[PDB]
Each structure stands twice: as structure tokens, then as C-alpha cells.
Amino acid sequence: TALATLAGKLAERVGMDSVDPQELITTLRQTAFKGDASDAQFIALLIVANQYGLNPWTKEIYAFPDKQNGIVPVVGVDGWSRIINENQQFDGMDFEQDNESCTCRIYRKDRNHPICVTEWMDECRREPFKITGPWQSHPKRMLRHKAMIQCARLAFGFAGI
Amino acid sequence: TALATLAGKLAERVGMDSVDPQELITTLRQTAFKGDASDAQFIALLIVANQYGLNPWTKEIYAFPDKQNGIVPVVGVDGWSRIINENQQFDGMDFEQDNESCTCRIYRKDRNHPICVTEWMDECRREPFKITGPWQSHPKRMLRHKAMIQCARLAFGFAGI
Amino acid sequence: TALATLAGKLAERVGMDSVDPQELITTLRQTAFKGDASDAQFIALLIVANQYGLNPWTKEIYAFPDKQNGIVPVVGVDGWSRIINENQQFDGMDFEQDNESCTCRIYRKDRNHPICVTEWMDECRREPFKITGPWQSHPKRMLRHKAMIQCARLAFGFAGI
Amino acid sequence: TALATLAGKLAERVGMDSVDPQELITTLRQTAFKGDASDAQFIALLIVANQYGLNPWTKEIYAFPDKQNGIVPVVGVDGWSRIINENQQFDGMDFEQDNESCTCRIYRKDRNHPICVTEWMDECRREPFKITGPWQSHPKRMLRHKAMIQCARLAFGFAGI
Amino acid sequence: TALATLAGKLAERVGMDSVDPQELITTLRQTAFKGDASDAQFIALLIVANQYGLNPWTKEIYAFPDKQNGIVPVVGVDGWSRIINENQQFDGMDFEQDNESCTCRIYRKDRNHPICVTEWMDECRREPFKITGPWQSHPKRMLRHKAMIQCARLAFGFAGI
DNA sequence: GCAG
DNA sequence: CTGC
DNA sequence: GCAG
DNA sequence: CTGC
DNA sequence: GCAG
DNA sequence: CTGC
DNA sequence: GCAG
DNA sequence: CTGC
DNA sequence: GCAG
DNA sequence: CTGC
């Protein structure tokens, strides 16, 4: 039942009145939950994403199905990129990199002291699946994503969201 | 049903009253979704593009059909080019390039510290399909597109859109 | 009974009216309480998390089932990251690390004297379970989490929350 | 009788109306009083914790059952960490440590003279139970907890709480 | 009779309406008076603690049953720690220690001259009972408690309480 | 990763 | 012209 | 740990 | 393409 | 002690 | 993947 | 003396 | 995992 | 003299 | 665990 009013209201938002809900629900469920996902897991992702204050369609927040029908949420690089950019006290940021590490420093206008975090590649890197992943094809970008996330967890966090 | 009122209303916007909807729907579906695409995937692209705040006809945002009838969205260089240009706090940008890297730095009026990102060609470049692509015929432009996108993800993101 | 109104109200918050509560309750219970958990233990986690002033869905606070049907609460790195960031008197922080220790110093605007704490790896590190954990794959990050928590216990604590 | 209205009111505080009180009371009793505890000992912990001005669910204050059905209260490191942090005259603190001692000095804004206390490990350390405790696995942290408590007993105490 | 209204009112202070008073009275009597104590001795401790201006539940003041049914009051280290900390004229304190003595000096804002007292271990120390006491396991702390008490008797006393 |  |  |  |  |  |  |  |  |  |  409830997924048909969600699919309908979302369609009505783009002016697409009177869709067949079943093919649309299925399409949308496989968009946010890539892979198999009970409707109970799909509606759980919608309420959890609202608790974080983040948008699932935009891929600001992911989730994957747990063993025994729970879910596991995962805030992405775009979720943290929202959180630091819609706060008025942010004052810019800078980075440093080499063959093995990345450093990221965040400044804010009210706080006198910048906050700085350093990440390390050989603990962040992942082995090839099975086969080729982004940790094989793009390593120097993939580490800089991780160092920004870890700094924004401390400089801002979820406080005020 | 709903695609015929979409095709009709869009036509009525250019003063083309009383079109035959079936040939127009087909034409329009193959414009935004290049290649085969269920109507459920086509109406999903319309609602997702509205969630990002971007226009599909203008190619600010693409999508491709997933395996098992989902979709995958892709914000293009014109989507980020909109997002940084319709924000009042943007204060210009500069670039640096060589045989192997591109750097892009974005300034904003309220933030004291510029934000700067660097991209690398030999991880961004793609192998020839099958046959000749833009990563064969235009490499020095194709990298500069990637470095602008990656910087605009951090300097602005989706915050306030 | 009471879990069905909780699951319902939470769904109504995301606009998902008239869900089947049983599959949703089960999904949600296994999200916050990973593993087996009586409904009496699940409702105990909800009231305890409110007493700390922290959110369970966001993983700011965990709990695990005790022997003889109690529970054990555990404030996480995101719980302390909230608490120091939603307080107006925080004035930034800095860190120091090596092969064996981490130091963290917290400043505040009203207090003249910074507060500083040091942690040590060979007492904080954990042995492999059974098999590979984060204390095997990520040690230099895992220690820095512990040193921030221990400092924030003294510089702020639960005073005013 | 009275425990069912306590369990009920606490549940009503998290919006969980109409719980079965018996499983909840049992769960809660085993949370605050770990181990066996008469209801008369459980309600005694609630009134004593109010006299100190501290919260039992948060583990700011513990108690254990006496021989002949009394109780013994124990203010924890988080109880003293509350008491020094919710007082306006606190002005920061500093520490010193070595192989055998810890010193802690507390400053306050109105008092001209700081107050300083020193603790010693070989009198504070405890022998292994029966088997491995925190006085085996974490000694350098476990002593620093004791030195802060002992200083805060003199610099603030219970005056004004 | 009177103990049931005391136990009741105290419970009503923590919101525990309609307790069985007999098990609660017994629990509370054995908390403040550890060991056997007539109800006449228990109500005598309550009125005497009010005359000193100190709280019995908090262990600011102890008592023990006399031979021939009197009582003996004993102000503790927390009773003196209250008395010097809730007085506005206190101006901090300092200590000196060695193998055999402890010195404590108290300053106050209105009085020009600090007051200083010295204690000695071999007269303060106690022999083992029967078996191991705090005068065996913690001697350097146990003496510093005695030197603070003796100084606070002269620098403040009960004047104005 | 989708640009020409 | 491609998507784990 | 989820990015391309 | 993965989750203790 | 619970993070990835 | 763990809790005296 | 109760912390992890 | 402990309390004279 | 009663603290842990 | 103690009180002349």
C-alpha cells in the first residue's frame, strides 16, 4: 500500500499524474536500494535518511541490506559535502598529499583554532574484489575523499542537523 | 497515459496545440534516454532530475538504464556549471595544467580560504572502446572537465539546492 | 503494542502512511540492536538514549544485550562529536601522534587553560577475534578516535545536556 | 506497585505508551543495579542519586547491594566530570604522569591559588580478580581517573549541589 | 510511625509514590547506620546531622552506636570539603608531604595571614584490625585527608553554619 | 563513468 | 561509446 | 566500507 | 563491487 | 569495549 | 566482531 | 573500590 | 569483576 | 577514629 | 573495619 502513494506523490511533483505504480515502485526501489531489498527495508531507508537530514535519491546517503533483514546506513562524500557547505560558520579548507598520506584542515569563523586530520593509504586501500575496483583505477582521488570525510566528522558532525 | 499529458503540455508551451502524442513521446524518450528505456525508467529520470534541481532536456543531468530495470543518474559538466554560476557567493576560479595533471581553484566571497583540487590524467583517461572516443581525440579538454567537477563538489555541493 | 505506534509514527514522519508494522518493527529492531534483543531491551534503549540526549538511529549511541536481560549502553565517537560541536564555548582542538601514543588538546573560549589527554596504543589495541578486525586493518585511526573521546569526557562531559 | 508508574512514565517520556511493565521493570532494574537487587534497594538507589544531584542511567553514580540488604553508593569519574563542568568558576586543569605517580592541578577564576593533588600507582593498583581486569589491561588511564576524582573532591566538592 | 512518613516523603521526592515502607525503612536505616541501630538512634542521627548543617545520605557525616544506646557523630573528609567550598572568603590551599609528615596551608581573602597545620604519620597511622585496612593499602592518601581536616577546623570551623 |  |  |  |  |  |  |  |  |  |  504505502509505496504506491509515495510513488504517486513523487510523480505528481514532476506533473506526471496517474502512473501505473507497480513498475515505478520497482524502478525506484532498485535505484536507491541497488540489489534485492524487502519493502520493509526500503521504507526503513526512507525514515533513517530523514533522521540524518539527507536525501537518498541524490546519493548523499546509501544503505545495504543486513543479514536477518536489518539495514546498514552509510553517509557518502556528498552527504558530508552538503553538511559542511550549508553551515554559515565554515571558512574554507586545505589539503596536502604524497605517495602514502593525505592531510585535510578545516577552518571555521567563530573557532580560533583550525582542526586538522591525516589519513594513510595502505590502511585505507582495499584489495581487488574476486574484479578491478576504484581502489585499483583511481587511488589518489579515493584517499582524498576519505580524508575529507574524517575531518568533517569532527569540525561539524551532526550538531544542529 | 501520463506521458501523453507531458508531451502535450510541453508542446502547448511552444504553441503546438493538438499533436499526435505517440510519435512525439517516442521522439522525446529517445532524446533524454538515448537507447532503450522502459516508460517506468523514463518517468523515474524526470522525478530524480527534479530532486537534483537540474534539467534533463538541456543535458545538465544524464541517466542510463540499470540491469534489473533501475536507473543510474550522472550529473554532467553543465550541471555543475549551472550550480556554481547561479550562486551569489561565487568569486571566480583559476586552473593549471601539464602533460599529466590539472589543478582547479575556486574562490567565494564570504569564505576567507580558497578551495583547491588536483586531478591526474593516467587515472582519469579511458581505454578505447572495442572504437575511437573523446579520451583519444580530445585529452587536454577532457581532463579539465573532470577537475572542475571535482572542485565544485566541495566548494558548493548541493547545499541550498 | 507500543512498538507498532512507534513504527507507525516514524513512518508518518516520512509520509509513508498505513505500513504493515510487524515487518517494519522487526527491521528497525535489528537496525539499532544488531543481533537478538527482547522488545523490553529495545524500549529500554530508546529511553536511555533520550536520557543521554543522543540519537540511536544515527549511531551516536550503541547498546548490547546483557546476560540476564539487562542492556549495556556505549556512547560512540559520533556521540562525543555531537556533544563538543553543539556547545557554544568550544574553541577548536589539536592532535599529536607517533608509533605508540596519541595526544589531544581541547580549547574553550571562557576557560583560560586548555585541557590535554594522552592515550597509548599497546593498552588500547585489541587482539584478533577468533577473524580480522579494525584494530588489525586501521590502527592509526582507531587510536585517534579513543584519544578524542577521552579528552571530551573532561573538557565538556554531560554538563548542561 | 511504584516501579510500574516509574517504568510507565519513563516510557511515556520516549513516546512508548502502554508497555507491559514487568519485563521493562526487570530490564531497567538489571541496567542500573547490575546483579541481584531487591526492589527496596532499587528505589533506595533512585532517592540517593537525587540527593547527590546525579543520574543513575547515565552511570554518573553506581551502587552495590550491601550484606544485610543496605546499599553502598559510588560516585564515578563521570559524576565528578559533570560536577566540575557545570560550575561557572572552573578555569581549566592540567596533569603530570610517570611510571609510578600522577599529579592533577585544578584552577578556578575567583580563587587566587590553584589546588594540586598527587596519586601513586602501587597503592591505587588492584590485584587480578580470581580473571584479567582494567588494572591489568589499561594501567596508565586507570590511575589518571583516580587523580582527577581526588582533586575535584577538594576544589569543588558537593558545595552548591 | 515517623520513619514511614520520612521514607514515604523521600520516595515522593523521586516520584516513587505508594512504596511499602517497612523494607524501605530497613534498607535506608542500614545505609546511613551501617550495622545494628535502634530507631531512636536512627532519628537521633537525622536531628544531629541537621545541627551540623550536613547530609547523612551523602556521607558528609557518619555516626556509630554508643554503649548504652547513645550515638557518636563523626564529620568526614567530605563534610569539611563542603564547609570550606561553600564559603565565599576561601582563597585556595596548598600541601607538602614526605615519608613521615604532611603540611596543609589555607588562604582566605579577608584575613592577611594564611593558617598552616602539620600532621605526623606514626601517630595518625592505625594498626591492622584483627584484617587489612586502608592504613595498610593507601597510607600517603590517608594522611593527607587528616591534614586537611585539622587545618579546616581552625581556618573556618562551624562559624556561620 | 556522459562527452563530442 | 560504457557502467561494477 | 559506497565510488565511478 | 563488499559488509564483521 | 562499537568501528568499518 | 566482543562485553568482566 | 566501578571501569571497559 | 569486587566491597571491609 | 570513617575510608575504600 | 573500630570507638576510650
Residue numbers in the entry:
A (entry chain A), B (entry chain A), C (entry chain A), D (entry chain A), E (entry chain A): 3 to 132, 139 to 169
Paper text:
The Redβ protein of the bacteriophage λ red recombination system is a model annealase which catalyzes single-strand annealing homologous DNA recombination. Beta), a 29.7 kDa protein, binds to and protects this exposed nascent ssDNA, catalyzing its annealing to a homologous DNA molecule. λExo and Redβ have been shown to interact in a 1:1 monomer:monomer stoichiometry to form an Exonuclease Annealase Two-component Recombinase (EATR) complex (a.k.a. However, in a manner reminiscent of E. coli SSB, annealases bind to ssDNA, holding it in an extended conformation, removing secondary structures and protecting it from degradation. The N-terminal domain (NTD) mediates oligomerization and contains the catalytic functionality.
We present the structure of the DNA-binding and oligomerization domain of Redβ annealase from phage λ. This structure, resolved to 3.3 Å, was obtained by cryo-EM via helical reconstruction, using a C-terminally truncated Redβ177 bound to two 27mer complementary oligonucleotides. Helical reconstruction and subsequent symmetry determination of the 1-start helical population identified a twist of −12.947 degrees and a rise of 2.078 Å. A single turn of the 1-start helix contains 27.8 asymmetric units, each corresponding to a Redβ177 monomer. In general, the Redβ N-terminal domain consists of a mixed αβ fold consisting of five α-helices, a 310 helix and five β-strands, which form two separate β-sheet elements. The model of Redβ177 was reconstructed as a compact, solenoid, helical filament with dsDNA wound around the outside. This superstructure is stabilized through substantial electrostatic contacts between adjacent monomers in the complex. The outward-facing DNA-binding groove accommodates both strands of the annealed dsDNA product, with an observed stoichiometry of four base pairs per Redβ177 monomer. A total of nine hydrogen bonds between the phosphate backbone and the side chains of R128, W143, H153, K154 and R161 secure the inner, template ssDNA strand in the DNA-binding groove of Redβ177. In addition, the incoming strand is stabilized in a planar orientation through a π-stacking interaction between the phenyl ring of F66 and the purine or pyrimidine ring of the position 3ʹ nucleotide and two hydrogen bonds between R128 and the adjacent nucleotide at position 2ʹ. The annealed duplex DNA is also stabilized in an extended, planar conformation in the DNA-binding groove, which is atypical of B-form helical dsDNA conformations often found in solution. It is likely that upon annealing, the planar conformation is maintained through an induced distortion in the phosphate backbone of the inner (template) DNA strand, which is stabilized by a network of seven hydrogen bonds with R128, W143 and K154.
